[PDB]
Coordinates of C-alpha atoms and ligand atoms in Angstrom, one line a residue:
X1 CA -12.0 -137.2 -138.2
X2 CA -8.2 -136.8 -138.3
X3 CA -6.8 -134.8 -135.4
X4 CA -4.4 -132.0 -136.1
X5 CA -2.5 -133.2 -133.0
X6 CA -2.5 -135.9 -130.4
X7 CA -0.7 -135.6 -127.0
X8 CA 1.9 -138.3 -126.4
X9 CA 1.2 -140.9 -123.7
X10 CA 3.9 -139.6 -121.3
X11 CA 2.6 -136.0 -121.6
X12 CA -0.8 -137.4 -120.8
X13 CA 0.6 -139.4 -117.8
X14 CA 2.4 -136.3 -116.5
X15 CA -0.5 -133.8 -116.8
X16 CA -1.7 -132.5 -113.4
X17 CA -5.2 -133.4 -114.5
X18 CA -4.2 -137.0 -114.8
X19 CA -2.7 -136.9 -111.3
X20 CA -5.9 -135.3 -110.1
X21 CA -8.1 -138.1 -111.5
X22 CA -5.9 -140.8 -109.9
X23 CA -6.0 -139.0 -106.6
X24 CA -9.8 -138.3 -106.8
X25 CA -10.3 -142.0 -107.7
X26 CA -8.4 -143.0 -104.6
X27 CA -10.1 -140.6 -102.2
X28 CA -13.4 -139.3 -103.6
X29 CA -14.9 -142.1 -105.6
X30 CA -13.9 -140.7 -109.0
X31 CA -13.4 -143.2 -111.9
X32 CA -9.8 -144.3 -112.2
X33 CA -10.4 -145.5 -115.8
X34 CA -11.9 -143.8 -118.8
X35 CA -9.8 -140.6 -119.0
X36 CA -11.4 -137.2 -119.4
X37 CA -14.7 -138.5 -120.7
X38 CA -15.1 -140.5 -117.5
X39 CA -13.7 -137.7 -115.2
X40 CA -16.0 -135.2 -116.8
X41 CA -19.2 -137.3 -116.4
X42 CA -18.3 -137.8 -112.8
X43 CA -17.6 -134.1 -112.3
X44 CA -21.2 -133.4 -113.4
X45 CA -22.9 -136.5 -111.9
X46 CA -21.2 -136.0 -108.5
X47 CA -21.0 -132.2 -108.6
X48 CA -20.7 -131.6 -104.8
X49 CA -18.0 -134.2 -104.4
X50 CA -16.1 -132.9 -107.5
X51 CA -15.9 -129.4 -106.1
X52 CA -15.0 -130.7 -102.7
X53 CA -12.2 -132.6 -104.5
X54 CA -11.1 -129.4 -106.2
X55 CA -10.8 -127.5 -102.9
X56 CA -8.8 -130.3 -101.3
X57 CA -6.5 -130.8 -104.3
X58 CA -5.6 -127.1 -104.2
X59 CA -5.6 -126.9 -100.4
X60 CA -8.2 -124.1 -100.3
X61 CA -8.2 -123.2 -96.6
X62 CA -11.7 -122.1 -95.4
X63 CA -11.2 -120.1 -92.2
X64 CA -14.7 -121.0 -91.2
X65 CA -15.9 -124.5 -92.3
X66 CA -18.6 -124.9 -94.9
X67 CA -21.9 -126.4 -93.9
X68 CA -22.1 -128.2 -97.2
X69 CA -20.6 -127.8 -100.7
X70 CA -24.0 -126.9 -102.3
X71 CA -27.3 -125.9 -100.8
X72 CA -29.9 -124.6 -103.2
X73 CA -28.9 -125.8 -106.7
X74 CA -31.3 -123.9 -108.8
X75 CA -30.2 -121.1 -111.2
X76 CA -29.7 -118.3 -111.0
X77 CA -28.4 -117.9 -107.5
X78 CA -27.1 -121.3 -106.6
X79 CA -25.7 -121.6 -103.0
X80 CA -22.0 -122.5 -102.9
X81 CA -20.1 -123.5 -99.7
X82 CA -22.6 -121.8 -97.4
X83 CA -21.0 -121.1 -94.0
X84 CA -17.4 -121.0 -95.4
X85 CA -15.1 -117.9 -95.3
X86 CA -11.9 -117.3 -97.2
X87 CA -9.8 -114.6 -98.9
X88 CA -8.7 -114.6 -102.6
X89 CA -5.6 -112.5 -102.0
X90 CA -4.5 -114.7 -99.1
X91 CA -4.6 -117.7 -101.4
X92 CA -2.9 -115.9 -104.2
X93 CA 0.0 -115.0 -101.9
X94 CA 0.7 -118.4 -100.4
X95 CA 3.8 -118.8 -102.5
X96 CA 5.4 -115.8 -100.6
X97 CA 5.7 -118.3 -97.8
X98 CA 7.2 -121.1 -99.9
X99 CA 9.4 -119.4 -102.5
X100 CA 9.7 -115.8 -101.2
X101 CA 12.6 -114.7 -103.3
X102 CA 11.3 -116.1 -106.6
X103 CA 9.6 -113.7 -109.1
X104 CA 5.9 -113.4 -108.6
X105 CA 5.6 -110.8 -111.4
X106 CA 7.8 -110.1 -114.4
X107 CA 6.8 -106.8 -115.9
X108 CA 7.8 -105.1 -119.1
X109 CA 6.9 -102.2 -121.3
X110 CA 7.9 -101.2 -124.8
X111 CA 11.6 -101.0 -123.8
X112 CA 11.4 -104.8 -123.6
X113 CA 13.5 -104.9 -120.4
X114 CA 11.7 -107.1 -117.9
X115 CA 11.8 -106.4 -114.2
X116 CA 10.9 -108.8 -111.4
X117 CA 8.8 -108.3 -108.3
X118 CA 9.5 -111.2 -105.8
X119 CA 6.7 -113.1 -104.0
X120 CA 8.0 -111.5 -100.7
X121 CA 8.0 -108.0 -102.2
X122 CA 4.5 -108.5 -103.7
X123 CA 3.1 -109.7 -100.4
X124 CA 4.7 -106.7 -98.6
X125 CA 3.4 -104.1 -101.1
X126 CA 0.0 -105.6 -101.0
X127 CA 0.0 -105.5 -97.1
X128 CA 1.2 -101.9 -97.1
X129 CA -1.5 -100.8 -99.5
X130 CA -4.3 -102.9 -97.8
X131 CA -3.5 -101.2 -94.5
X132 CA -3.7 -97.8 -96.3
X133 CA -7.0 -98.7 -97.8
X134 CA -8.3 -99.7 -94.3
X135 CA -7.1 -96.4 -92.9
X136 CA -8.9 -94.6 -95.7
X137 CA -12.1 -96.2 -94.5
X138 CA -12.6 -98.9 -97.2
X139 CA -14.9 -101.5 -95.7
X140 CA -15.7 -104.9 -97.1
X141 CA -18.1 -104.4 -100.0
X142 CA -17.0 -100.9 -101.0
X143 CA -16.1 -100.6 -104.6
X144 CA -12.5 -99.7 -105.5
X145 CA -12.0 -98.6 -109.1
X146 CA -8.9 -98.5 -111.4
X147 CA -8.1 -96.7 -114.6
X148 CA -5.0 -98.7 -115.3
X149 CA -2.9 -100.4 -118.1
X150 CA -1.3 -103.8 -117.6
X151 CA 1.3 -102.8 -115.0
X152 CA 2.4 -104.4 -111.7
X153 CA 0.7 -101.6 -109.8
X154 CA -2.7 -102.9 -111.1
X155 CA -2.0 -106.3 -109.6
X156 CA -0.9 -104.9 -106.3
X157 CA -4.0 -102.7 -106.2
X158 CA -6.4 -105.6 -107.1
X159 CA -4.8 -107.9 -104.5
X160 CA -4.9 -105.1 -101.8
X161 CA -8.5 -104.5 -102.6
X162 CA -9.4 -108.2 -102.3
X163 CA -7.3 -108.3 -99.0
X164 CA -9.7 -105.7 -97.4
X165 CA -12.8 -107.3 -98.9
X166 CA -13.2 -104.3 -101.3
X167 CA -14.8 -105.0 -104.7
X168 CA -12.5 -104.4 -107.6
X169 CA -13.6 -102.8 -110.8
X170 CA -11.4 -101.4 -113.6
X171 CA -11.1 -100.0 -117.2
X172 CA -8.0 -99.7 -119.3
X173 CA -6.9 -96.2 -120.2
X174 CA -7.6 -96.6 -123.9
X175 CA -11.3 -96.3 -122.9
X176 CA -12.7 -92.8 -123.3
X177 CA -14.4 -91.0 -120.4
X178 CA -18.0 -91.8 -121.4
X179 CA -17.2 -95.5 -121.6
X180 CA -15.5 -95.4 -118.2
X181 CA -18.3 -93.4 -116.6
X182 CA -21.1 -95.6 -118.1
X183 CA -19.4 -98.4 -116.2
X184 CA -18.1 -96.9 -112.9
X185 CA -21.1 -94.6 -112.2
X186 CA -23.3 -97.6 -111.9
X187 CA -21.3 -99.0 -108.9
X188 CA -20.3 -95.8 -107.1
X189 CA -16.7 -96.5 -106.1
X190 CA -15.1 -94.8 -103.2
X191 CA -11.5 -95.1 -104.4
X192 CA -9.9 -94.6 -107.8
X193 CA -6.4 -95.9 -108.7
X194 CA -5.2 -94.2 -111.9
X195 CA -2.2 -93.5 -114.1
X196 CA -1.5 -90.1 -115.7
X197 CA -1.2 -91.8 -119.1
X198 CA 0.7 -94.6 -120.9
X199 CA 2.9 -95.4 -123.9
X200 CA 1.8 -97.5 -126.8
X201 CA 3.2 -98.0 -130.3
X202 CA 6.2 -95.9 -129.2
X203 CA 3.9 -92.9 -128.6
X204 CA 2.9 -91.2 -125.4
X205 CA -0.8 -91.0 -124.5
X206 CA -1.5 -88.3 -122.0
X207 CA -4.5 -88.9 -119.8
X208 CA -4.4 -86.1 -117.3
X209 CA -7.5 -84.3 -118.6
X210 CA -9.4 -87.6 -118.6
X211 CA -8.4 -88.2 -115.0
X212 CA -9.6 -84.7 -114.1
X213 CA -12.9 -85.4 -115.9
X214 CA -13.4 -88.8 -114.2
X215 CA -12.8 -87.3 -110.8
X216 CA -15.3 -84.5 -111.4
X217 CA -18.0 -86.9 -112.7
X218 CA -17.5 -89.5 -109.9
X219 CA -18.6 -87.6 -106.8
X220 CA -18.7 -90.8 -104.6
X221 CA -14.9 -91.0 -104.8
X222 CA -13.2 -90.2 -101.4
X223 CA -9.6 -91.0 -102.4
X224 CA -7.6 -91.0 -105.6
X225 CA -4.3 -92.8 -105.9
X226 CA -1.9 -91.4 -108.6
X227 CA 0.5 -93.7 -110.4
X228 CA 3.0 -91.5 -112.3
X229 CA 3.6 -93.8 -115.3
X230 CA 4.5 -90.8 -117.5
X231 CA 6.3 -89.2 -114.6
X232 CA 3.9 -86.2 -114.0
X233 CA 3.1 -84.8 -110.5
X234 CA 0.1 -86.1 -108.5
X235 CA -2.9 -83.8 -109.0
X236 CA -4.2 -81.8 -106.0
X237 CA -6.3 -84.0 -103.7
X238 CA -4.6 -87.3 -104.8
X239 CA -2.2 -89.7 -103.1
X240 CA 1.2 -90.7 -104.6
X241 CA 1.4 -94.5 -105.2
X242 CA 4.9 -95.0 -103.8
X243 CA 4.0 -93.4 -100.4
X244 CA 1.3 -96.1 -99.8
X245 CA 3.3 -99.2 -100.7
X246 CA 6.5 -98.7 -98.6
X247 CA 5.4 -100.0 -95.2
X248 CA 6.4 -103.4 -93.7
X249 CA 3.5 -104.4 -91.5
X250 CA 1.9 -107.8 -90.9
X251 CA -0.3 -108.9 -93.8
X252 CA -4.0 -109.0 -92.8
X253 CA -6.7 -110.6 -94.9
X254 CA -10.4 -110.1 -94.4
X255 CA -12.1 -113.4 -94.1
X256 CA -15.3 -113.0 -96.2
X257 CA -18.2 -115.4 -97.1
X258 CA -17.8 -117.5 -100.2
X259 CA -20.3 -115.3 -102.1
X260 CA -18.6 -112.1 -101.1
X261 CA -18.1 -110.0 -104.2
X262 CA -14.6 -109.9 -105.6
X263 CA -15.0 -107.8 -108.6
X264 CA -17.5 -106.2 -111.1
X265 CA -16.8 -106.9 -114.7
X266 CA -18.7 -105.2 -117.6
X267 CA -20.5 -107.0 -120.4
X268 CA -19.6 -106.2 -124.0
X269 CA -23.3 -105.9 -124.8
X270 CA -24.1 -102.7 -126.7
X271 CA -27.7 -102.1 -125.5
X272 CA -28.4 -99.7 -122.6
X273 CA -25.8 -99.4 -119.9
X274 CA -23.1 -102.1 -119.9
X275 CA -24.2 -104.9 -117.6
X276 CA -22.3 -104.8 -114.3
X277 CA -21.5 -108.4 -113.6
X278 CA -20.7 -109.3 -110.0
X279 CA -18.6 -112.4 -109.3
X280 CA -17.6 -113.8 -105.8
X281 CA -14.2 -114.3 -104.1
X282 CA -15.0 -117.9 -103.6
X283 CA -16.5 -118.6 -107.0
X284 CA -13.5 -117.0 -108.9
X285 CA -11.1 -118.7 -106.5
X286 CA -12.3 -122.3 -107.2
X287 CA -13.1 -121.8 -110.8
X288 CA -9.8 -120.2 -111.7
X289 CA -7.9 -122.8 -109.7
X290 CA -9.7 -125.5 -111.7
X291 CA -9.0 -123.9 -115.1
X292 CA -5.4 -122.9 -114.3
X293 CA -4.1 -126.0 -112.5
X294 CA -6.1 -128.7 -114.3
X295 CA -7.2 -127.3 -117.8
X296 CA -4.0 -125.2 -118.3
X297 CA -1.7 -127.5 -116.4
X298 CA -0.1 -124.6 -114.5
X299 CA 1.8 -125.0 -111.2
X300 CA 4.4 -123.4 -108.9
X301 CA 7.3 -121.8 -110.9
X302 CA 5.6 -121.9 -114.3
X303 CA 5.5 -118.5 -116.1
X304 CA 2.2 -117.4 -117.5
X305 CA 2.1 -114.7 -120.1
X306 CA -1.2 -113.6 -121.7
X307 CA -1.0 -110.7 -124.1
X308 CA -3.9 -108.6 -122.8
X309 CA -5.4 -105.2 -121.9
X310 CA -6.7 -104.9 -118.4
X311 CA -10.0 -104.2 -120.1
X312 CA -10.3 -107.9 -121.2
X313 CA -11.3 -110.8 -118.9
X314 CA -8.1 -112.5 -119.8
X315 CA -6.3 -110.0 -117.5
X316 CA -8.3 -111.2 -114.6
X317 CA -7.6 -114.8 -115.6
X318 CA -3.9 -114.0 -115.8
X319 CA -3.8 -112.4 -112.4
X320 CA -5.3 -115.6 -110.9
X321 CA -2.1 -117.4 -112.1
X322 CA -0.8 -116.4 -108.7
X323 CA -3.3 -118.8 -107.1
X324 CA -1.3 -121.8 -108.4
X325 CA 2.1 -120.3 -107.4
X326 CA 2.7 -119.4 -111.0
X327 CA 4.8 -116.3 -112.0
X328 CA 2.8 -114.0 -114.2
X329 CA 4.1 -111.8 -117.0
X330 CA 2.7 -108.3 -117.4
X331 CA 3.3 -106.4 -120.7
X332 CA 2.1 -102.9 -121.1
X333 CA 2.5 -102.1 -124.8
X334 CA 1.6 -102.8 -128.5
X335 CA 1.6 -106.3 -129.9
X336 CA 3.7 -105.2 -132.8
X337 CA 6.2 -102.7 -131.4
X338 CA 9.0 -102.2 -132.1
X339 CA 8.4 -105.1 -134.6
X340 CA 5.8 -107.7 -135.5
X341 CA 7.3 -110.3 -133.3
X342 CA 7.0 -108.2 -130.1
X343 CA 4.8 -110.6 -128.1
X344 CA 7.3 -113.4 -128.9
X345 CA 10.2 -111.3 -127.7
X346 CA 8.4 -110.8 -124.4
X347 CA 7.8 -114.5 -124.1
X348 CA 11.5 -115.1 -124.8
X349 CA 12.8 -112.4 -122.4
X350 CA 10.6 -113.5 -119.5
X351 CA 11.0 -117.3 -120.0
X352 CA 7.3 -117.8 -120.4
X353 CA 6.1 -121.4 -120.2
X354 CA 2.5 -120.7 -121.3
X355 CA 2.0 -117.9 -123.8
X356 CA -1.5 -116.9 -124.5
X357 CA -2.4 -114.7 -127.5
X358 CA -4.8 -114.3 -130.3
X359 CA -5.2 -116.5 -133.4
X360 CA -5.1 -113.2 -135.4
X361 CA -1.6 -112.4 -134.0
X362 CA -0.3 -115.9 -134.8
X363 CA -1.5 -115.6 -138.4
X364 CA -0.1 -112.1 -138.8
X365 CA 3.3 -113.3 -137.6
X366 CA 3.2 -116.2 -140.1
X367 CA 2.1 -113.8 -142.9
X368 CA 5.0 -111.4 -142.1
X369 CA 7.6 -114.2 -142.2
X370 CA 8.4 -114.2 -138.5
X371 CA 10.1 -117.4 -137.3
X372 CA 9.8 -117.0 -133.5
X373 CA 11.0 -120.4 -132.3
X374 CA 13.8 -120.4 -134.8
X375 CA 15.1 -116.9 -134.1
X376 CA 14.4 -116.5 -130.4
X377 CA 15.1 -118.7 -127.4
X378 CA 11.6 -120.1 -126.8
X379 CA 12.9 -123.3 -125.2
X380 CA 10.9 -122.5 -122.0
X381 CA 7.5 -122.5 -123.9
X382 CA 5.4 -125.6 -123.3
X383 CA 2.1 -124.3 -124.5
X384 CA 0.8 -121.6 -126.8
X385 CA -2.8 -120.7 -126.2
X386 CA -5.3 -118.6 -128.2
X387 CA -8.8 -117.5 -127.1
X388 CA -11.6 -116.2 -129.3
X389 CA -11.6 -117.1 -133.0
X390 CA -10.1 -120.6 -133.5
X391 CA -6.6 -120.9 -135.1
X392 CA -7.0 -122.2 -138.7
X393 CA -5.3 -125.5 -139.6
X394 CA -2.6 -123.9 -141.6
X395 CA -1.9 -121.6 -138.7
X396 CA -1.9 -124.5 -136.3
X397 CA 0.5 -126.5 -138.5
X398 CA 2.8 -123.5 -138.9
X399 CA 3.0 -122.9 -135.1
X400 CA 3.5 -126.6 -134.3
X401 CA 6.0 -127.2 -137.1
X402 CA 7.9 -124.1 -136.2
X403 CA 8.6 -125.6 -132.8
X404 CA 8.8 -129.2 -133.9
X405 CA 11.5 -128.4 -136.5
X406 CA 13.7 -127.4 -133.6
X407 CA 12.9 -130.6 -131.7
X408 CA 10.2 -129.2 -129.4
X409 CA 6.7 -130.8 -129.1
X410 CA 4.3 -127.8 -128.4
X411 CA 0.9 -128.1 -126.9
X412 CA -1.3 -125.6 -128.8
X413 CA -4.4 -124.8 -126.7
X414 CA -7.6 -123.3 -127.7
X415 CA -9.7 -121.6 -125.0
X416 CA -13.0 -119.7 -125.0
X417 CA -13.0 -117.3 -122.0
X418 CA -16.0 -115.1 -121.5
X419 CA -16.8 -112.2 -119.1
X420 CA -20.1 -113.7 -117.9
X421 CA -18.5 -116.3 -115.7
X422 CA -14.9 -115.0 -116.1
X423 CA -13.9 -118.5 -117.4
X424 CA -14.8 -121.0 -120.2
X425 CA -17.7 -123.4 -120.5
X426 CA -15.6 -125.3 -123.0
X427 CA -12.0 -125.3 -124.1
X428 CA -8.7 -126.9 -123.5
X429 CA -7.8 -130.2 -121.9
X430 CA -4.1 -131.2 -121.9
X431 CA -4.8 -134.9 -122.4
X432 CA -7.0 -134.8 -125.5
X433 CA -6.4 -134.6 -129.2
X434 CA -6.9 -131.3 -131.1
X435 CA -9.3 -131.2 -134.0
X436 CA -9.9 -128.5 -136.7
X437 CA -12.4 -125.8 -135.5
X438 CA -13.3 -127.6 -132.3
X439 CA -13.0 -126.8 -128.6
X440 CA -11.8 -130.0 -127.0
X441 CA -14.4 -130.4 -124.2
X442 CA -16.8 -128.8 -121.7
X443 CA -14.8 -127.9 -118.6
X444 CA -14.9 -130.0 -115.5
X445 CA -18.1 -129.5 -113.5
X446 CA -19.8 -128.0 -116.6
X447 CA -22.9 -129.8 -117.9
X448 CA -22.8 -128.3 -121.4
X449 CA -25.4 -129.5 -123.9
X450 CA -26.8 -128.4 -127.2
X451 CA -30.6 -128.0 -127.0
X452 CA -33.3 -128.0 -129.7
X453 CA -36.2 -125.5 -129.4
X454 CA -38.0 -128.1 -127.3
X455 CA -35.2 -128.2 -124.7
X456 CA -34.1 -131.7 -125.6
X457 CA -30.4 -132.5 -126.1
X458 CA -28.7 -132.9 -129.5
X459 CA -25.6 -134.8 -130.7
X460 CA -23.9 -133.8 -133.9
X461 CA -26.7 -131.3 -134.7
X462 CA -26.8 -127.5 -134.3
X463 CA -28.6 -126.2 -131.3
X464 CA -28.5 -123.8 -128.4
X465 CA -25.5 -123.9 -126.0
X466 CA -26.9 -124.5 -122.6
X467 CA -25.4 -125.2 -119.2
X468 CA -27.8 -127.2 -117.1
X469 CA -26.0 -127.0 -113.7
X470 CA -24.6 -124.2 -111.5
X471 CA -21.0 -123.1 -111.7
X472 CA -19.3 -121.3 -108.8
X473 CA -18.2 -118.3 -110.9
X474 CA -21.6 -117.6 -112.4
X475 CA -22.6 -114.0 -111.4
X476 CA -24.0 -113.5 -107.9
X477 CA -26.1 -110.9 -109.7
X478 CA -25.9 -107.8 -111.9
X479 CA -25.3 -104.5 -110.1
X480 CA -27.9 -101.8 -110.9
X481 CA -30.5 -104.4 -112.0
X482 CA -33.9 -103.9 -110.4
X483 CA -35.8 -107.2 -109.9
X484 CA -32.9 -109.0 -111.5
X485 CA -34.6 -108.4 -114.8
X486 CA -31.4 -108.0 -116.9
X487 CA -29.7 -111.0 -115.4
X488 CA -32.8 -113.1 -116.0
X489 CA -33.3 -111.8 -119.6
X490 CA -29.6 -112.5 -120.3
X491 CA -29.6 -116.2 -119.8
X492 CA -32.7 -117.6 -118.2
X493 CA -35.7 -116.5 -120.3
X494 CA -35.6 -119.3 -122.9
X495 CA -35.4 -122.6 -120.9
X496 CA -36.6 -122.3 -117.3
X497 CA -33.8 -122.8 -114.7
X498 CA -31.2 -123.4 -117.4
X499 CA -28.3 -121.1 -118.5
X500 CA -28.8 -120.3 -122.2
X501 CA -25.7 -118.7 -123.4
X502 CA -26.7 -117.4 -126.9
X503 CA -24.3 -119.6 -128.9
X504 CA -25.3 -121.7 -131.8
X505 CA -23.3 -124.9 -131.3
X506 CA -22.7 -128.5 -132.1
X507 CA -21.8 -131.0 -129.3
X508 CA -20.1 -133.8 -131.2
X509 CA -20.3 -137.5 -130.3
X510 CA -16.7 -137.2 -129.2
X511 CA -17.8 -134.7 -126.6
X512 CA -16.1 -131.7 -128.2
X513 CA -17.8 -128.4 -129.1
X514 CA -18.1 -126.4 -132.3
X515 CA -19.3 -122.8 -132.0
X516 CA -21.0 -121.8 -135.3
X517 CA -21.9 -118.2 -134.2
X518 CA -24.3 -116.3 -132.0
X519 CA -27.8 -117.7 -131.9
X520 CA -29.4 -114.3 -132.2
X521 CA -27.3 -113.7 -135.4
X522 CA -27.9 -116.9 -137.4
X523 CA -28.9 -116.8 -141.0
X524 CA -32.2 -118.6 -141.6
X525 CA -32.6 -120.1 -145.1
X526 CA -32.1 -124.2 -142.1
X527 CA -30.3 -122.1 -139.5
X528 CA -26.7 -121.1 -140.2
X529 CA -24.0 -119.7 -138.0
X530 CA -22.2 -116.6 -139.2
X531 CA -18.8 -117.8 -137.9
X532 CA -18.6 -120.5 -140.6
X533 CA -19.1 -117.8 -143.2
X534 CA -16.6 -115.4 -141.8
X535 CA -13.9 -118.0 -141.9
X536 CA -14.5 -118.8 -145.5
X537 CA -14.9 -115.3 -146.9
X538 CA -12.1 -113.8 -144.8
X539 CA -9.5 -116.3 -146.1
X540 CA -9.7 -114.3 -149.3
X541 CA -6.7 -112.0 -149.6
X542 CA -8.8 -109.0 -150.8
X543 CA -11.1 -109.1 -147.8
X544 CA -9.8 -107.6 -144.5
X545 CA -13.0 -108.2 -142.5
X546 CA -16.6 -109.0 -143.2
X547 CA -20.1 -108.8 -141.6
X548 CA -23.1 -110.9 -142.6
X549 CA -26.7 -110.0 -141.6
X550 CA -30.1 -111.6 -142.3
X551 CA -33.3 -109.7 -142.1
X552 CA -36.9 -110.8 -142.8
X553 CA -35.4 -112.4 -146.5
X554 CA -32.4 -110.2 -147.3
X555 CA -28.9 -111.5 -146.6
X556 CA -26.2 -108.9 -147.5
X557 CA -22.5 -109.4 -146.9
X558 CA -20.6 -106.3 -145.9
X559 CA -16.9 -106.3 -146.8
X560 CA -14.1 -104.1 -145.7
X561 CA -11.5 -104.5 -148.5
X562 CA -7.7 -104.8 -148.2
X563 CA -5.8 -101.8 -149.5
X564 CA -5.5 -101.9 -153.3
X565 CA -8.4 -104.4 -153.7
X566 CA -11.5 -103.5 -155.7
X567 CA -15.0 -105.0 -155.5
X568 CA -15.3 -106.2 -159.1
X569 CA -17.2 -108.9 -160.9
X570 CA -14.2 -111.2 -160.5
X571 CA -14.1 -110.5 -156.7
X572 CA -17.8 -111.1 -156.3
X573 CA -17.4 -114.4 -158.2
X574 CA -14.5 -115.5 -155.9
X575 CA -16.6 -114.6 -152.9
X576 CA -19.7 -116.5 -154.0
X577 CA -17.6 -119.4 -155.2
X578 CA -15.6 -120.1 -152.1
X579 CA -18.8 -120.0 -150.1
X580 CA -20.9 -122.4 -152.2
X581 CA -17.9 -124.8 -152.3
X582 CA -16.6 -124.8 -148.7
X583 CA -20.0 -124.4 -147.0
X584 CA -23.1 -124.6 -149.2
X585 CA -25.3 -122.7 -151.7
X586 CA -27.5 -121.7 -148.7
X587 CA -24.6 -119.7 -147.3
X588 CA -24.2 -117.5 -150.4
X589 CA -25.1 -113.8 -149.7
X590 CA -28.0 -112.1 -151.6
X591 CA -25.7 -109.1 -152.1
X592 CA -22.1 -107.9 -151.4
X593 CA -21.6 -104.3 -150.2
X594 CA -18.2 -102.6 -149.7
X595 CA -17.8 -100.7 -146.5
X596 CA -15.2 -98.4 -145.0
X597 CA -14.9 -100.8 -142.1
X598 CA -16.6 -103.2 -139.6
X599 CA -17.8 -101.7 -136.3
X600 CA -16.9 -103.5 -133.1
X601 CA -17.6 -103.6 -129.3
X602 CA -14.8 -102.0 -127.2
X603 CA -13.3 -105.5 -126.9
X604 CA -13.3 -106.0 -130.6
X605 CA -16.3 -108.3 -131.0
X606 CA -18.4 -108.0 -134.2
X607 CA -21.7 -106.2 -133.7
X608 CA -24.2 -108.0 -136.0
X609 CA -27.2 -107.3 -133.9
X610 CA -26.9 -103.5 -133.6
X611 CA -26.2 -103.3 -137.4
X612 CA -29.3 -105.4 -138.1
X613 CA -31.4 -103.0 -136.0
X614 CA -30.0 -100.0 -138.0
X615 CA -30.7 -101.8 -141.3
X616 CA -34.2 -102.4 -140.0
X617 CA -34.6 -98.7 -139.6
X618 CA -33.9 -98.1 -135.9
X619 CA -32.2 -94.7 -135.6
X620 CA -28.5 -94.8 -134.5
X621 CA -29.4 -92.7 -131.5
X622 CA -31.7 -95.4 -130.2
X623 CA -30.0 -98.6 -131.5
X624 CA -26.8 -98.6 -129.4
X625 CA -25.0 -97.1 -126.5
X626 CA -22.3 -95.3 -128.4
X627 CA -19.9 -95.5 -125.4
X628 CA -19.9 -99.3 -126.0
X629 CA -18.9 -99.4 -129.6
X630 CA -15.4 -98.6 -131.1
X631 CA -16.3 -96.2 -133.9
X632 CA -19.4 -94.1 -134.0
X633 CA -18.9 -92.7 -137.5
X634 CA -18.4 -96.2 -138.9
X635 CA -21.7 -97.3 -137.3
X636 CA -23.3 -94.1 -138.7
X637 CA -22.5 -95.4 -142.2
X638 CA -25.0 -98.2 -141.7
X639 CA -27.7 -95.8 -140.5
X640 CA -27.1 -93.8 -143.7
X641 CA -27.4 -97.0 -145.7
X642 CA -30.8 -97.8 -144.2
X643 CA -31.8 -94.1 -144.8
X644 CA -30.7 -94.4 -148.4
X645 CA -32.7 -97.6 -148.8
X646 CA -35.7 -96.3 -146.8
Ligands
CA701 CA1 -31.6 -120.4 -106.8
CA702 CA1 -8.1 -111.8 -145.6

């Protein structure tokens, strides 16, 4: 297997993860030799010592000592650092004591004119707001909610919430009221931070009526804090943001147990109410430190820009950049406004050193004839990362060569972040080569395996992604989950005591990971992942997006066509051809059906399972939570299809 890219030996030697291994080998019995393969095996075989090592390396300061690193090891509900106390916000703001006048936040909107908030100023605003939250009666454990775009106020609010031991939960303001309420009503927040609207694509999006509706339908709220993004007056009964952040009193951080809830995230699952996933201050603290400082190589003074809505877990990951003393870049706006290269212009104007984006955006830039490294000053960029669908080899080459032609050797990273543990089970390692369509390795401390139906491990064979050991950022539990039934059914109902993620994967002999698709959405004719098929079909110019389903056996391919394209015999021939060639005859659809579009979750994930149910005759009204999908009418198309075929 020929790598797309191999890191040079000095880059390897200079990686923080390499320094960590050397230090761990001196002080904690880690292997000095053997590189990542050896470090990883140690991180799993000596799990307690590994996490101890992580906390020392990052100087996590427990205000009360832990009794041990790990008590009960069984899942779900493993017992991390029992006895210890800490505070996430306190750790995040440590750099205010070391480089107070450096920028902690660089924020920007569609004017593309960045503004800084210094570490000292961030610490002060957070302390002011935390004191106000305490005065409003927010106690440790109370939920504090936000209806907020990616603006510096959202970071200040989250940190202030964590500082008081409040439990953060948020939605972005492109969510409609039913989607927001389906989430927030489950956890009964006592505070709401909210904007009056936002700007996107050069257009104004008023949210005053939505805010009025949220307030009326959330009767547990006791205080509402208004952020006048569009410059409107605070509604009756609300507090004005600027009045709460202006004080200069001593920072105070609530020292909470390791397991104390930090935030509630919401699953993208489309059945029933969205799962309300609770993660701990301690678990997120150590896992995000590990990912950011070791897997992403981030440290003090770096500048981390991920293009993201606050409604995606990548925002939470971005916020945690502060934990490593890293400046974070916040952009509230469209990815292509005023022009296609907008995200690159932000990276330029903020001096980003790590720029995280989507493979789709990279490909769209290449297609549009953008040359970002040539035309902008991207000399500060050391790494470009994508999460979600993998960057194809022509995209990787373009990106790398675009920087390489100008004398820069770029690290192109592929990660796979998920809401469930607010991190990745597998993804990037700065010291390993990159291969087509692979995630480089399971993360440190993650015992990832591919299991057959009998629960035995496979190598170079497709199987179920399992994680056989506990990770600190795994959910404490789901909120609004009697008996813990939904949490159990989500991961623990297939192999006892083992986390089964629902991904159909290969774990290669080189220790890397290929994700073929969702296990519950495979095509069985031999069990095939749908991802492989989407890659092939969707390379065709005429096909904007596709969706493949298999039902007991009928295997139709739904295609949303590019403008001007027509589903003719020639097109059907090209479709079937590219499939039987690049994959196999088994992969060829029984039928191709043109569609007005492809329905998605709110986060833009394909919804194969709900569509399958519809095609199986389940009425739309009972198949999905409509607040959890992006286009009701598009989904109704598929119900009509089943009705027509009934
Ligand atoms: Ca347990
Ligand atoms: Ca295409």
